[PDB]
Amino acid sequence: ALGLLRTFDAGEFAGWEKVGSFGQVYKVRHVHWKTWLAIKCSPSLHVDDRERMELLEEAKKMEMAKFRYILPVYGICQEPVGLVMEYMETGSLEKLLASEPLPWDLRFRIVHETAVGMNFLHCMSPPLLHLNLKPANILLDAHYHVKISDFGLAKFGTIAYLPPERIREKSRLFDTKHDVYSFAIVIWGVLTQKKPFADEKNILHIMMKVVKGHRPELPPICRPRPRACASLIGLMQRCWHADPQVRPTFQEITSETEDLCEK
Numbered sequence: 049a050l051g052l053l054r055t056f057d058a059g060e061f062a063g064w065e066k067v068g069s070f071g072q073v074y075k076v077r078h079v080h081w082k083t084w085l086a087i088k089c090s091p092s093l094h095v096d097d098r099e100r101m102e103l104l105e106e107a108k109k110m111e112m113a114k115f116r117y118i119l120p121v122y123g124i125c126q127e128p129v130g131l132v133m134e135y136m137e138t139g140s141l142e143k144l145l146a147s148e149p150l151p152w153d154l155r156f157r158i159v160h161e162t163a164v165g166m167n168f169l170h171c172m173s174p175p176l177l178h179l180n181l182k183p184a185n186i187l188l189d190a191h192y193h194v195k196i197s198d199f200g201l202a203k204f205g206t207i208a209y210l211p212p213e214r215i216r217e218k219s220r221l222f223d224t225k226h227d228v229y230s231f232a233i234v235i236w237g238v239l240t241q242k243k244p245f246a247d248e249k250n251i252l253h254i255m256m257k258v259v260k261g262h263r264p265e266l267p268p269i270c271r272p273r274p275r276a277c278a279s280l281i282g283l284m285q286r287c288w289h290a291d292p293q294v295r296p297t298f299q300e301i302t303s304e305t306e307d308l309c310e311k
């Protein structure tokens with residue numbers, strides 16, 4: 049796993065340029081390779097042995113899940129201590145959702161592609177749980193194709209993506225149904241181009257209500273694609289069901305999201 053990863057000295061990089069902010073991420077040019085890469089640096093003053101080993105474990109999990117819809121990893125830098133990855137020109141889904149209204153065919157393709165990447169992770173032996181999926185992690189290339197990132201918590205404003213069973217049970221064991229819930233909240237963001245619970249001031253009250261089956265407000269059926277929109281709303285609702293075992297698998301999810309992209 050960690051054998052094929054390279055070590056980068058910072059002299060190989062140039063034109064450092066912020067994109068993140070967690071840990072500052074930079075678009076860097078590799079001068080010899082004549083292409084761009086992304087480097088996530090440490091957020092601290094001194095990077096001890098815990099970080100170095102965590103950053104390595106994060107790298108190795110990315111290499112383990114090498115796939116079309118998963119962000120590629122190249123290696124670790126030591127000069128500044130950072131993780132060296134593929135650069136994606138368009139950036140996060142969060143930024144894209146805030147920038148302008150997106151055509152529905154693209155919305156459906158983003159959801160499908162995200163679902164296919166998540167399904168890949170869950171098909172691994174053993175399954176790889178993402179556990180941090182949100183629009184800030186979902187990256188888009190120059191032609192708006194998805195690659196999933198952020199494997200730092202794999203095995204703040206993130207309360208909205210947290211399953212209700214994680215609020216009910218102190219230290220429940222993580223499972224595939226955690227990711228399925230988060231994916232539902234990702235769908236809601238694609239449907240509305242809004243952030244979930246943006247209006248609400250009482251963070252705790254909403255968390256308590258969520259344990260009883262409270263969710264982001266259902267959007268209306270859209271005009272341009274009312275059948276597919278209705279179908280996606282329904283799928284979203286099953287994916288955010290209060291009972292984890294009623295929620296669909298990503299095998300079942302991908303079958304359905306694929307049909308939304310047909311025609």
Ligand SMILES: Cc1cc(Nc2cc(N3CCN(C)CC3)nc(Sc3ccc(NC(=O)C4CC4)cc3)n2)[nH]n1
Nearest residue numbers: 067068073086088134135136137138139140197198199
């Ligand atoms: C890791 C990574 C990041 C990128 N590319 C980009 C590019 C980008 N921008 C594209 C250009 N516009 C003008 C501004 C936004 N904005 C982000 S915002 C962003 C920052 C970091 C992460 N993910 C991580 O932190 C990875 C390490 C786990 C996702 C999105 N990420 N390629 N690879």
Ligand SMILES: [Cl-]
Nearest residue numbers: 273274275276
């Ligand atoms: Cl339709």
